[PDB]
Design a protein around this ligand. Sequence first.
Ligand SMILES: Nc1ncnc2c1ncn2[C@@H]1O[C@H](CSCC[C@H](N)C(=O)O)[C@@H](O)[C@H]1O
Lengths: 265, 265
Amino acid sequence: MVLYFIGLGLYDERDITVKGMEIAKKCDYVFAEFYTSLMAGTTLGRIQKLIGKEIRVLSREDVELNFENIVLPLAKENDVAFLTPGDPLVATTHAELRIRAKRAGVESYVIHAPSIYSAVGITGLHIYKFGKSATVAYPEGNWFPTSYYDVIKENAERGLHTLLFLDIKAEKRMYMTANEAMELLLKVEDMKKGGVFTDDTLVVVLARAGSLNPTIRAGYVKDLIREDFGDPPHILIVPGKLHIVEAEYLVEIAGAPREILRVNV
Amino acid sequence: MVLYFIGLGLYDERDITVKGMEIAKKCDYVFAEFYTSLMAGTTLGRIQKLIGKEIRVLSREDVELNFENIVLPLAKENDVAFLTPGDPLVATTHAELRIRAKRAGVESYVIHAPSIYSAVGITGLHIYKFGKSATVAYPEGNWFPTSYYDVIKENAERGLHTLLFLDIKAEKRMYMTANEAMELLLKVEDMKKGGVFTDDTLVVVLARAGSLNPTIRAGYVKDLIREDFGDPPHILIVPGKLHIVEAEYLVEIAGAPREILRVNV
Ligand SMILES: Nc1ncnc2c1ncn2[C@@H]1O[C@H](CSCC[C@H](N)C(=O)O)[C@@H](O)[C@H]1O
């Protein structure tokens, strides 16, 4: 009669918390979703071996349309686990799955795990200075979305950092790179002429957060746009005016040019 | 030859990530600090038992003034770990310690852990809608901090949620409750009179995130200001304009007034 929402963390099968691992191990049934994101540093087989359980993967449709027909029935008389990359309920639509559980007379509990929202602290940027967050989406057909650009403008206008999630095609395992995102942003700048993102804009790139060897780079677009940040996933950040302490960390830890100590502080 | 910053998580010792546990288990020396936050569900003994190592707890002074004299010296000839609650680089100034490690010729790595910054997702509020964050600090003598009031104001004008970290005096064992935070906010409201925080302001309280049964409550200040949310730590949130799905969750899961379902578009 219990449903556990368990986060898998940032990168590999060891990014789950001990609490999450032990509880998933005691569950009769274990489901997981990999449509909101992926666990780039591991595989389903590796996650299965860690918790010692068979894992049934669920598609977006399985969850959004039939969660109550696939997961909740079993959770009525057994202990069930629902695994998701990152931290549970940070997805966006998953929170309402708890309401579904309620309607079904099922108890649900949340087992947290690291999320990129907090992991970006490794960039040396103060977490309290982050403003509204956004996602850079791939244009397609006649659709050219640009709202993420206005988000940067509004944040930077208030001296706030902007965390930009990059588009991902989970099912096809396709990731948008920090490079492509910068190209897209420059293209949007050229159309809106707001002076929000140019070759001179200072940006931070965080790749493979959760890994023991993530790529943390900071510098001006003109210099990073064609740099190789390694394998995905990549996270792009457009900082607001920096506190000297933030800048010194980007210089010392992220290889930022000394120039930022006088231009972006 | 290495220093590891390892987060212990939100509430108890099992909130550490498996990665963090495995690494800690093999370190020669393990240091820790328990002043940046409160882990209400465990003890030093249990953490020690989990990683099978003796842990030396440091004070804020030990860290801020003598980190390079107490910890770094040992990291030059051994594998050393530094443990902190939640995520080590979120709402703390520990990032700067990585610069000290560098200047001492010590390589450092960061192992993330569940953080309150992302755990707020359990309140049902969209995490991308959060704006600048702030801290509600205890007034000291004639000094009465009020900047957090302005943060709320700014976010609300943009319709963004505001995450308010609550103060903590570890050595004095003082942990600010959401009730005290609200009292302080009302006082600041009387002084500035900006109509930012009143008895009619909707608020969300999250207490002891990470435990299996955290306290999740939403409602008008007038009704929550005298409510018992249980033992600390507590965190206060002032939502901006709500999306219908956020309202439904607050009502269904956090016992908020049904009237908030009638949003003003
Ligand atoms: N489990 C928990 N539940 C509610 N609030 C919490 C919490 N853990 C931390 N906080 C909040 O955050 C403050 C400490 S700020 C340090 C936060 C830490 N690095 C992290 O990543 O979580 C506390 O005073 C409290 O207001």
